[PDB]
Design a protein around this ligand. Structure first.
Ligand code: ADL
Lengths: 112, 112
């Protein structure tokens, strides 16, 4: 969704530490390769965007959710979220567990 | 911009460690201030979305740019950006220097 859409009530920023750009590429390919097709229809799921850090050390996911409850009930309480975590943790090149930060949009600056 | 808009060639995720929920509002208020409107007309700027960590300890800015040059020079060479940095660094309640992670969007999972 647009980054400043009011429907976005909850965001998770997840950082995955990797051993270099080849693993960055593989990790994004894995994340968008069909393992999480099921998440697209989850009520409250708005988006998951995966980025490669320019220094080659991490893959960052910026995920928008309609609310914390929707995230908790429709993602965290679904066992398929554990399946997803296992999938992404299986990749060679992943150097530590993913780190998450939870947060709510509070202000924005859009273009003129 | 939409998170998967093809114009977004470069993203910065800037984290500002703060001492509490009160300073989070102060920091967002300052950063989305109104004197900061010149940023809206910077060539290549697409969006700045300021978030408050749910735990009250951080303010996180997800910023969309057309390219790394737009951020670095169009924004970064303008003196107003140095002004803005100093402003943010001088706010009481800051627990340390802002930390930026630079990255490129590589893939997105979205609802149909
Ligand atoms: O200079 C730093 O590293 C700290 C720091 C302070 C203020 C800002 C930034 C920043 O990075 C940004 O990036 C940034 C951006 O990308 C898009 C919009 C506003 C800011 C404001």
């Amino acid at each position: 969704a647009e980054v400043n859409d009011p429907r976005v009530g909850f965001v998770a920023v997840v950082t995955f530490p990797v051993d270099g750009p080849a693993t960055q590429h593989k990790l994004v390919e894995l994340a968008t390769g069909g393992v999480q097709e099921w998440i697209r229809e989850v009520p409250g799921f708005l988006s998951a965007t995966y980025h490669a850090s320019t220094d080659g050390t991490a893959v960052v996911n910026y995920a928008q959710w309609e609310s914390e409850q929707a995230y908790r009930v429709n993602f965290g309480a679904d066992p398929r979220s554990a399946e997803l975590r296992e999938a992404l943790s299986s990749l060679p090149g992943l150097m530590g567990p993913p780190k998450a930060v939870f947060m709510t949009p509070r202000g924005a600056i859009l273009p003129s």
